[model samples]
Target: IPDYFKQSFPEGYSWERSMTYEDGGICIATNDITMEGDSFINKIHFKGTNFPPNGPVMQKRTVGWEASTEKMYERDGVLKGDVKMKLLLKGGGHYRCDYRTTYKVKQKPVKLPDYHFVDHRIEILSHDKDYNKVKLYEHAVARNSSVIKPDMKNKLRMEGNVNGHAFVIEGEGSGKPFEGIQTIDLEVKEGAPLPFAYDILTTAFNRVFTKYP
Candidate 1:
């Protein structure tokens, strides 16, 4: 049997309180592309705040996942898969929000020693014609640490984009921070033309295997 399954929720799902799972697992279904001779595991975490000291308040909720395959494939190879995530709410109010995302395993997965850290740098350079006047409209950075355990964090970096803009985010977690840093660099060019930038940052935050061995 599959580890997790997918379900359909209302247009909006929300959480008003916090919940935790010391040791837990979920069964997620994989697409035809991911189920081909490959093993995958997904981790999800939930954190809520802004609760009413007396009434009901809205908090924040974030979702992240990590995936790996035994073999390698082409650059465009699809590494898409999904895990059945169990949602646990702490507070009693009804929250309205939904979380969903997809990831593609890179053609080559960096192999690291048991206890070591990997640094990943992602840079997005604008076209020369628009470099000078290019303006950054918005920016965001998100991270998910462990899979076996449900723990994750996310933050929004900047609201507007300026010229020669850059964002460097780092995190440490179990089995390396999967899906690294995903960034969106938007620019507005006059007659020259608008250019889009998508930069993906992947790195290892910390190592725990050393103590085990």
Candidate 2:
């Protein structure tokens, strides 16, 4: 895998803890994604892949495999304020998390300034009890289209870095699942920015619909 946790439980929820695995290469997976009502904020169902508990950290319906978004709004460059989230299985009591991220078109090396295209920076913070997630407090000149690699796949890719740690994300249409618009396999090292990283790429950025698909 990679040295990232991809974060928390449900793709939407946030939690703390560097991921850990036994001796086997046991990765993780949740069941289908569902909706609670006629909208995205209404709720999101995250079914668990359970029989016993292959997941040591995942307690039965621990946080809801099926949960919802009470609130979610993002400005062009800021996070949603009242980002409420709740669990649907047996009322996973007022689960709380700090999910605040901000975006800015990092600039400076103007050479008197001509355009845009650089790494990034975050002046973002978020580390609390119920939830703990933070990125490397730094930025890099953006990577551009010209930066190709022999190993790169023909798909989308994103990279995160801080201090000395680095996180990169990229994917190709599934050649397996034997599946949907796509099926991706996410693996990470000990501790990574998890559900936070997972959700944005998978949940927030996806298809359109008149109803949940």
Candidate 3:
């Protein structure tokens, strides 16, 4: 997965890392990728059999897995922001996670190529019994709204309901503090094969609508 993401950047990108596994092959990555004017630091721990690089090839698949990723973003060699995401899937098809982002820098007039003062916290709930059906909730705010004037930048925002509960969550550049239930339906229509957990975790790339640094 680390190499996969490394290849996602353009030609000028440079990378360094220590990617190893435990006794049972659980994956771990302490790596960073530096691009044009930004760099990304990643610390990810994964416990599953179907992860990339070299995954298991068996007819009887493995289930019940968990992964946590801590990604920090820097611009012009300065610490700008970070995001933490946790993903879990039980054998019984239960799934849940908390995705949070915090910006250490702020912008005025909501511009200047820096992140906003607003903080993002999103919770995803679902059951992989049907990968096409999943839901999530989001809460975005500023510690001092009056001083910072909360915002949600250009991040992906969603409005929907989970089990009939309404929610509205915004991504970066929205310029507002949104607190409500937002639904993210991670429907895998093509490209990858199921066991949706494998596809989701491997190609994470913040596809669930979390801001990318």
Best by lDDT: 3
TM, every model? 0.20, 0.25, 0.32
lDDT per residue (tens digit) for residues 85-171 in model 2: 222323444322322222111221112112222222222223333222322121222212212111211122334332233444433
Kindly report which residue stretches of model 2 are placed more than 4 angstroms away from their true locations once superposed. Answer: 1-66, 70-82, 85-96, 100-155, 173-182, 186-213
Displacement of residue 34 (Cα, Å) in model 3 is 24
Cα error, candidate 3, residue 62 (Å) = 11
Residue 21 of candidate 1: its Cα lDDT?
A: 21
Clash tally, candidates in order: 11, 16, 10
Return the lDDT, model 2, position 196. Answer: 28
Which of the two, 2 or 3, has more lDDT? 3
RMSD (Cα, Å) of model 3 = 13.4
TM-score of 1: 0.20
